[PDB]
Amino acid sequence: QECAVCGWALPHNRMQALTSCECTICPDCFRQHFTIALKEKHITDMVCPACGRLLSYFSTLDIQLRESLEPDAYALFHKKLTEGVLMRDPKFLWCAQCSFGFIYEREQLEATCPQCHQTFCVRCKRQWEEQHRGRSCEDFQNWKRMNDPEYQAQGLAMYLQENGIDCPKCKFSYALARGGCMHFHCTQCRHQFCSGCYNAFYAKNKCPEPNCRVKKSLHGHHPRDCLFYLRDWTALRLQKLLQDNNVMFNTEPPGCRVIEQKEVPNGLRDEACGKETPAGYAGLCQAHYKEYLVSLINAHSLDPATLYEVEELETATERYLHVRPQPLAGEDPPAYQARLLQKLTEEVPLGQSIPR
Amino acid sequence: EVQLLESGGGLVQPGGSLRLSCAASGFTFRGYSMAWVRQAPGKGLEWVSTISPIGTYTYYADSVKGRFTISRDNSKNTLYLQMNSLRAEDTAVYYCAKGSYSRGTPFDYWGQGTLVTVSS
Amino acid sequence: EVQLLESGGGLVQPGGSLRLSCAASGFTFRGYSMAWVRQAPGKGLEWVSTISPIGTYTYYADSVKGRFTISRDNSKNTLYLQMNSLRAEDTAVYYCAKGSYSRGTPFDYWGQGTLVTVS
Ligand SMILES: */C(=C/NC(=O)c1cc2c([nH]c1=O)CCCC2)CC(=O)OC
Ligand SMILES: [Cl-]
Ligand SMILES: [Zn+2]
Ligand SMILES: [Zn+2]
Ligand SMILES: [Zn+2]
Ligand SMILES: [Zn+2]
Ligand SMILES: [Zn+2]
Ligand SMILES: [Zn+2]
Ligand SMILES: [Zn+2]
Ligand SMILES: [Zn+2]
Helix, strand or coil: CECCCCCCECCHHHCEECCCCCCEECHHHHHHHHHHHHHCCCHHHCCCCCCCCCHHHHHHHHHHHHHHCCHHHHHHHHHHHHHHHHCCCCCEEECCCCCCEEECCCCCCEEECCCCCCEEECCCCCECCHHHCCCCHHHHHHHHHCCCHHHHHHCHHHHHHHCCEECCCCCCEECCCCCCCCEEECCCCCCEEECCCCCEEECCCCCCCCCCCCCCCCEECCCCCCHHHHCCCCHHHHHHHHHHCCCCCCCCCCCCCCEEEEEECCEEEEEECCCCCCCCCCCCCHHHHHHHHHHHHHHCCCCHHHHCCHHHHHHHHHHHHCCCCCCCCCCCHHHHHHHHHHHHHHHCCCCCCCCC | CCEEEEECCCEECCCCCEEEEEEEECCCHHHCCEEEEEECCCCCEEEEEEECCCCCCEEECHHHCCCEEEEEECCCCEEEEEECCCCHHHCEEEEEEEECCCCCCCEEEECCCEEEEECC | CCEEEEECCCEECCCCCEEEEEEEECCCHHHCCEEEEEECCCCCEEEEEEECCCCCCEEECCCCECCEEEEEECCCCEEEEEECCCCHHHCEEEEEEEECCCCCCCEEEECCCEEEEEC
16 A cells, blocks of 8 residues: 555555555655645645545545644644535534544435444434434433333332422422322422422421411421322322222332432432332332322322311311301201312312323 | 632522632633533533633533533633522532533543532 | 532542543433543543443544543443543543523533542
8 A cells, every 4th residue: 555645655554544545655745735725725725636526525535634723723624615615614513322423414304424334313413213213302212211121120119209309498309209298308409399299398387377376386387189198198088089080000010129319428329119019000019109199190280178077078178278167947958968079179289280 | 721710609699699600711712612611519520511712612411401501702711600590409619611523521631629609 | 409529639640640520410311421521730621531421432533542441330420530541631620510401501510510630
């Protein structure tokens, strides 16, 4: 082998192989010929110096120009490319698979990396597959996530983690399930709130709620459809509220695999819940299965008061209306029940800040 | 030699606005992309935004899209970051960074950094 | 949130060995390529190596290819860099980097860095 403009005998690996014309050129003549064309000729003069051989050429030539030229010479190449050819900055793409950067000025939505020779969508940067043809990137991204075996193996744990906990004070989002503990502590803002209804957990004598009888205790106030109360329901009764409104729920899966955060010396460690997964609980523990049912209940704005008996309606009346109810003359228990239910649903809405 | 100096950081109330600046020197400003990266408490670096040599293309991390605006004044060799609707999670040291075209290095130098904190 | 913690940097003699680790959390580790970069004193950031999501492919800078070996354990969400026959030029702060599918950058997160000094 030898350089095609000066004849210098040199091995193939020690010269620059022009990807277009395949002329072998020494580093010195390559570097000298292309910098003089930038500083004294025009952009069209940057053909090979040996053979005299538009946008794909510059896209490939930019690679070899970057390694051989000087920084100020490489900048003049982008300047003349912008001011003489493109009227704008060149579209520079970064390969997500091999971290190589390259100019891509073609019409196709699939770019082939000049380094790792792998093809990717120029807008979502994921590796190109035939399923992406004629499909939005979100449809394609959803197709891969819903065909990833290890994502499906997680089961409903992903649904509980996707529905995250947003701090009502500092809006910091946590991609965590609630579990059985409702008293949440935000590390960023120190605000204490209920993860089910986002109401404040008040310190001693901080609660402003009227007729509160636990003012001197750490506590919060919850709407009747908050997980704080609905966690005490049986899974059967929670499913009954769902069935009465034609809301489907899983009982079979599609140690509990729900990810929790254990505080360790090195910060926070992702630990699995690992509690018992009873039959009919979709592979989750008891607390996370009830959390899954209550999330479906909350998402559809189902009212648990529709299943209240008389004693439950009296408790709700004293709790949310601050009045001990009294049966009226001529009322039977059904009429007493309907009156209490009507007044409760009219005056006391469901959780106004519950994530639905 | 490359020198980058950020300014404009400070204490911001939630939902407030703030404009960062970055005076650059020691290289051809127009010849390179410029980027902003940030160090959240207990973290390393998170890419925020990148602007092309003459501002043709502006890229943003998902968490700042629609709230942040990157810009540059090539006549002054200054990079700008307009930050709107700031949240507590935006609290970080914000670094100015000189872009690069080499493999695996979207930027090769980043400055001293200006601290932005968002109260709660 | 995303977290990348490097460990394993220290003082080593020329010709020695050193194994760096990168503990990752806050994102599906197996779905992204991972990389190592470094910054020598007074120099610019230099790419070292990149490994594909499940480790099928590895890429190296010419100065480190063969001496360095990148690997990953997706079951533990950890990225490794085995550095053999360390030279004085390898003295740098080594950063762990997460591959990005966002337009405008090959990586969207870097770690805090670990300092390696070769005599
Ligand atoms: C009681 C519920 N709280 C939490 O689960 C919780 C989780 C995190 C944080 N704060 C919390 O209050 C901050 C950092 C992220 C994880 C759970 C409990 O204490 O066990 C009984
Ligand atoms: Cl890109
Ligand atoms: Zn020659
Ligand atoms: Zn030729
Ligand atoms: Zn590639
Ligand atoms: Zn796409
Ligand atoms: Zn908060
Ligand atoms: Zn509650
Ligand atoms: Zn109270
Ligand atoms: Zn569980």
